[PDB]
Amino acid sequence: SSYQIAVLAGDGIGPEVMAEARKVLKAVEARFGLNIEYTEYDVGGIAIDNHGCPLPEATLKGCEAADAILFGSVGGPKWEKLPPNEQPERGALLPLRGHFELFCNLRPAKLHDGLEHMSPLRSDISARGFDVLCVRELTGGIYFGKPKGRQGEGESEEAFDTMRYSRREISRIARIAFEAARGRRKKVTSVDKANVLACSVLWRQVVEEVAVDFPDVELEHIYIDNATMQLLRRPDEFDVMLCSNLFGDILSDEIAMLTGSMGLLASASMNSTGFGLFEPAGGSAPDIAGKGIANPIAQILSAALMLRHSLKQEEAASAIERAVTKALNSGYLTGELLSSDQRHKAKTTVQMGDFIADAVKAGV
Amino acid sequence: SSYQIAVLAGDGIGPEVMAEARKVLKAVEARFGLNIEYTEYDVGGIAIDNHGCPLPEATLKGCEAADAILFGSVGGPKWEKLPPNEQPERGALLPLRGHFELFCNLRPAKLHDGLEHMSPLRSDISARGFDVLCVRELTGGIYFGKPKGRQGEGESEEAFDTMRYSRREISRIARIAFEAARGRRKKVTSVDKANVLACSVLWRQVVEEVAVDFPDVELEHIYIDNATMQLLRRPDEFDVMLCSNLFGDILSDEIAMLTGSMGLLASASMNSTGFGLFEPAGGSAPDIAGKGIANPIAQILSAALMLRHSLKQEEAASAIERAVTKALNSGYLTGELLSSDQRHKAKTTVQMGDFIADAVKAGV
Numbered sequence: 001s002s003y004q005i006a007v008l009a010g011d012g013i014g015p016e017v018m019a020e021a022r023k024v025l026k027a028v029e030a031r032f033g034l035n036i037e038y039t040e041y042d043v044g045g046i047a048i049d050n051h052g053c054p055l056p057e058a059t060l061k062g063c064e065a066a067d068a069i070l071f072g073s074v075g076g077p078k079w080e081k082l083p084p085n086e087q088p089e090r091g092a093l094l095p096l097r098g099h100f101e102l103f104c105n106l107r108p109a110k111l112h113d114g115l116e117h118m119s120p121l122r123s124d125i126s127a128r129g130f131d132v133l134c135v136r137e138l139t140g141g142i143y144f145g146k147p148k149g150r151q152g153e154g155e156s157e158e159a160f161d162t163m164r165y166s167r168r169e170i171s172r173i174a175r176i177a178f179e180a181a182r183g184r185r186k187k188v189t190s191v192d193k194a195n196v197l198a199c200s201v202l203w204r205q206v207v208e209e210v211a212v213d214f215p216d217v218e219l220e221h222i223y224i225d226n227a228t229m230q231l232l233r234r235p236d237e238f239d240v241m242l243c244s245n246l247f248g249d250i251l252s253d254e255i256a257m258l259t260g261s262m263g264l265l266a267s268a269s270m271n272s273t274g275f276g277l278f279e280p281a282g283g284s285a286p287d288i289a290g291k292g293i294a295n296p297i298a299q300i301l302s303a304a305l306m307l308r309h310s311l312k313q314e315e316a317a318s319a320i321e322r323a324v325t326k327a328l329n330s331g332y333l334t335g336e337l338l339s340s341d342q343r344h345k346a347k348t349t350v351q352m353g354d355f356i357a358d359a360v361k362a363g364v
Numbered sequence: 365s366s367y368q369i370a371v372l373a374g375d376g377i378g379p380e381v382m383a384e385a386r387k388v389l390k391a392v393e394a395r396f397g398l399n400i401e402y403t404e405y406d407v408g409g410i411a412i413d414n415h416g417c418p419l420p421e422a423t424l425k426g427c428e429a430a431d432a433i434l435f436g437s438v439g440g441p442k443w444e445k446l447p448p449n450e451q452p453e454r455g456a457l458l459p460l461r462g463h464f465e466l467f468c469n470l471r472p473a474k475l476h477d478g479l480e481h482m483s484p485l486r487s488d489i490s491a492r493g494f495d496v497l498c499v500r501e502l503t504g505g506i507y508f509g510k511p512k513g514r515q516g517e518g519e520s521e522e523a524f525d526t527m528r529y530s531r532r533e534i535s536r537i538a539r540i541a542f543e544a545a546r547g548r549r550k551k552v553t554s555v556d557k558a559n560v561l562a563c564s565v566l567w568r569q570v571v572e573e574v575a576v577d578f579p580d581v582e583l584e585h586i587y588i589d590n591a592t593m594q595l596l597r598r599p600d601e602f603d604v605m606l607c608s609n610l611f612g613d614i615l616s617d618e619i620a621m622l623t624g625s626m627g628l629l630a631s632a633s634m635n636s637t638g639f640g641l642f643e644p645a646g647g648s649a650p651d652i653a654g655k656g657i658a659n660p661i662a663q664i665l666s667a668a669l670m671l672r673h674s675l676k677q678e679e680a681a682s683a684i685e686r687a688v689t690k691a692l693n694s695g696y697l698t699g700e701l702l703s704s705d706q707r708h709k710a711k712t713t714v715q716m717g718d719f720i721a722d723a724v725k726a727g728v
């Protein structure tokens with residue numbers, strides 16, 4: 001029957017881009033006869049202002065009652081001076097990921113046709129193009145390991161975090177990465193620091209174990225330091241990157257920046273039962289909120305991922321995805337996607353969402 | 365009296381580039397009337413072949429008897445299939461750094477005049493140039509924290525590593541970074557993951573404490589994921605990056621790759637008494653060993669750093685550095701520094717070292 005979405009738009013540009021994603025979703029809902037109901041909940045900075053913490057109990061409960069979380073972006077200068085355990089980004093995201101066992105983080109990143117010049121890559125390298133999916137383990141590793149904290153005082157005061165992974169944790173995220181590569185260019189690059197870390201040694205070992213179920217998929221391993229170098233020089237040679245929590249954090253950001261168009265990039269954080277959290281790869285960008293300049297595509301595509309992965313509405317997802325393609329090849333680009341020559345052709349946040357929603361309605 | 369250097373050339377191109385560094389050192393020794401004696405010791409792959417382990421007791425002892433270690437590069441496909449605790453790179457480097465308390469790792473990286481086109485950066489970004497020194501803590505953090513290892517079996521088997529830092533450890537590496545920035549463009553960017561890690565929270569706090577002694581130096585903090593993005597887009601805006609062990613590992617490699625000329629990059633790993641290990645930033649590059657194509661500059665400049673930091677021979681260090689500059693502006697470039705148009709002008713490893721040594725002798 002009726003799917004239920006918890007909408008957690010957050011701070012900065014979160015609400016202005018979410019409006020567009022909802023618009024585009026309305027068009028898909030009409031097209032494909034989907035019954036989806038949405039409820040908005042405060043999260044992040046806005047929840048601190050309205051409820052005193054970044055993840056109110058009522059927001060968490062709302063997410064428990066939902067089929068998926070359509071998440072915008074959290075954080076801003078207003079809350080930057082809070083203590084770490086009170087700050088809105090970590091305080092929204094990590095407890096959500098932990099509470100819903102969102103172990104799989106998917107961050108697809110491609111260099112889009114006609115947007116090479118925005119890539120910080122040398123032109124010959126951007127011309128080759130790339131499509132790299134980062135598959136990052138999201139509920140384990142050093143993010144959530146214990147013990148975590150500090151002891152002592154003065155010069156001998158120490159703080160500590162424990163990177164821990166079990167075989168089961170590694171194998172479930174590896175399987176996602178292999179399955180994904182099977183649908184793509186059949187290569188998994190597993191990123192670790194096996195020359196230094198015991199966690200990484202187990203990582204590498206278990207990824208090799210999972211590989212036996214995927215004779216069709218090429219496995220290679222790379223150190224995270226070396227990986228930062230290779231993505232810069234030859235990102236065309238990667239297909240799926242499979243990473244631990246901290247290493248995928250790092251690499252997914254690098255890869256996103258290499259596109260030159262982070263406003264296009266969405267992500268999915270999924271548990272094993274199909275519930276997930278779908279959010280743009282980029283931040284709350286408070287510098288631009290309320291001006292109608294923010295690119296809503298990453299939010300719109302977060303809604304497409306939501307449809308695909310949580311709602312099992314692949315047609316609807318793909319329709320959104322095609323409508324975004326159509327915008328990008330029909331002169332509907334926000335200002336950050338354009339060179340200075342061309343920046344006067346910039347579309348506003350509402351123009352973009354209107355275009356995209358209209359493309360969905362028109363049968364793209 | 366006579367300085368004593370332990371020379372640990374290692375594997376792959378290590379020995380062919382070390383020969384040049386020794387050549388250039390001989391010229392400096394003659395110029396500045398330095399009395400330096402050197403003894404070669406096996407390390408890495410060659411030590412596994414000759415002694416059964418990557419860091420023989422006699423090599424470690426040789427290093428104990430020395431004023432500094434002039435280190436080449438370790439590792440190669442021959443040893444790649446060994447267990448992690450037997451492999452030559454980690455097995456040479458980490459016990460050296462730990463045994464000599466080499467807490468400070470310095471990796472200067474600049475985009476050289478006339479070599480912008482080799483940078484994987486977009487041309488307008490490479491044209492702006494950059495000079496970024498990574499100051500990385502080298503003896504602490506997750507590299508050496510305990511507990512480290514694994515427990516259990518089967519799906520519930522777990523491995524673990526503990527990221528730990530005390531105030532004392534953070535403050536000593538922070539001081540290096542501030543002192544270095546005071547000599548440069550007066551900015552320290554401290555890189556952490558304070559939104560997630562307790563270790564990072566202490567990092568950030570203590571770096572802010574150290575800052576009070578440096579009113580002249582601008583401090584800013586950045587998350588390691590965000591840092592990977594910003595170095596790509598605007599590396600001209602960084603001066604000194606100050607990083608924990610794992611975060612500096614990652615970032616220093618990224619920054620080195622952004623130069624496009626890793627064969628030029630040297631590094632210094634120093635304890636608080638002035639003993640250190642000086643090594644190129646790039647690996648053993650077995651693909652090219654024995655062919656006389658390897659760029660010896662990074663090794664030559666490792667010898668310059670050795671002179672400066674361990675031997676207190678600043679004039680000699682700078683002479684080497686000027687002789688390398690002279691090579692690079694006098695058409696003495698190895699093939700990897702040249703575009704395909706120009707690659708037939710490539711100099712061999714010996715030609716480069718002969719040039720550089722001759723420039724030192726000639727009074728550059």
Ligand SMILES: CC(C)[C@H](C(=O)O)[C@@H](O)C(=O)O
Pocket residue numbers: 089090093094249559560589
């Ligand atoms: C905000 C922070 C806790 C988070 C993370 O580290 O996972 C963010 O960088 C991310 O990539 O979603």
Ligand SMILES: CC(C)[C@H](C(=O)O)[C@@H](O)C(=O)O
Pocket residue numbers: 195196225453454457458613
């Ligand atoms: C070989 C490895 C243990 C080492 C490190 O991780 O420190 C290397 O990557 C480095 O940058 O010197």
Ligand SMILES: [Mg+2]
Pocket residue numbers: 249250253589
């Ligand atoms: Mg991140």
Ligand SMILES: [Mg+2]
Pocket residue numbers: 225613614617
């Ligand atoms: Mg490294």
